[PDB]
Structure formats: structure tokens, C-alpha cells
């Protein structure tokens, strides 16, 4: 997982409104989210990964072991059961709640971190660059 480690800043986003709307996020939160450029920090300490997402709007932090389920409260206030694994060199984060699922997939492509978010028919792509 070592190539994912570091500090990353958002530089491009496509279809995030569609993804938020699919999750039921209200229009006022979508407004602010469309103008926010988060910083994501990924760190490791032995087998424990910590993923921080910082912005002027909301901040989140989770710590987990790969392949072990954990409880997570998301930035939009869903209480989900999560698991993160490495699949084909990608970091795959699966969230389940109320019979629903969403995936947050991170892959490294030409030095950039590409985050693909899928829920329902909505697919959002967010591109991060390393700081
Ligand atoms: C912590 C800041 C995340 C981005 C601004 C706040 C958005 C909150 C609205 C819906 C959350 C949807 C699920 C999390 C999206 C994370 C996107 C990302 O890491 O770039």
C-alpha cells in the first residue's frame, strides 16, 4: 500500500453532484461540496492505516486494518459497515448500510490518485495530486 501514502490535494472532479444526490445529500450541502477542494492524508503504522480528509467544510478520519470490517460514520452522516482491501493494486473501500452499497476505489495512474465513487447508477471521478 506504500505508493498510496502521503498527502494528496483535489485537482479535478466529475459528477460529484450526481453521486451526492444519489446518496440523498441535500441541495445546500451539495452547493458547498461542489466548491470544496479537500486534502487527503494516508498514513500507516504497522498494519493500521489512517485516512484523513480535511477541508474548510467537513473533516473526517478513519483508521482500519485491511480486510477487517469496521464501523464508519461518513461525512454525510450515514452509519455504515466498511471494509477496505487491496484488489489488483487498487484500494477498494466498500460501505454497506440498509441493504445499500457504495464503493470508493483509489488507483494510482501516472503519479495521480484517481478516486472513483459509485452508488446506484451514479459514477464520480475525482483526481488528486501529491503534495
Ligand atoms: C471530508 C470532506 C469531503 C468532501 C466535502 C464534503 C462532502 C460531504 C458530502 C457527501 C459525502 C459523500 C461521501 C464522501 C465523499 C468523499 C470524496 C473525497 O474524498 O474526495
Author numbering: 1 to 131
According to the publication:
For this purpose, fatty acid binding proteins (FABPs), small proteins which act as intracellular lipid chaperones, are good models since they have a large internal cavity occupied by a fatty acid (FA) and a stable cluster of well ordered water molecules. FABPs are 14–15 kDa proteins that reversibly bind hydrophobic ligands, such as saturated and un­saturated long-chain FAs. All known FABPs share almost identical three-dimensional structures, including a ten-stranded antiparallel β-barrel, which is formed by two orthogonal five-stranded β-sheets, as shown in Fig. 1. The binding pocket is located inside the β-barrel, the opening of which is framed by the N-terminal helix–loop–helix ‘cap’ domain, and FAs are bound to the interior cavity.
In this work, the structure of perdeuterated human H-FABP was determined for the first time at room temperature with combined neutron and X-ray diffraction data to resolutions of 1.90 and 0.98 Å, respectively (for statistics of the data collection and refinement). Analysis of the electron and nuclear scattering density maps showed that oleic acid (the FA naturally bound to H-FABP expressed in E. coli) does not occupy the whole internal cavity. The FA (yellow C atoms) is folded in the typical U-shaped conformation systematically observed in complexes between FABP and long-chain FAs. The water molecules are packed against the oleic acid and are connected with the external solvent through a narrow pore. These water molecules are very well ordered, even at room temperature (mean B factor for the O atoms = 15.6 Å2), more so than the oleic acid which presents a non-H-atom mean B factor of 32.5 Å2, ranging between 11.8 Å2 for the carboxyl group to 48 Å2 for the terminal methyl C atom. W31, located at the top of the U-shape of the FA, acts as a C—H⋯O hydrogen-bond acceptor in three interactions, with H⋯O distances of 3.46 (donor group is C5—H52), 3.38 (C3—H31) and 2.55 Å (C18—H181). This way, the conserved W31 water molecule bridges both extremities of the FA, clearly contributing to stabilizing its folded ‘U’ conformation. A clear electrostatic complementarity is observed, where the negatively charged FA carboxylate group interacts with the electro­positive potential of the basic Arg126 and Arg106 side chains. The aliphatic tail of the FA is mostly in contact with hydrophobic residues, allowing the formation of numerous intermolecular H⋯H bonds as well as two intramolecular ones, revealed by the presence of BCPs and bond paths. (iii) Within the cluster, the positions and orientations of the water molecules are strongly determined by the alignment of the water dipoles along the electrostatic field of the hydrated protein.
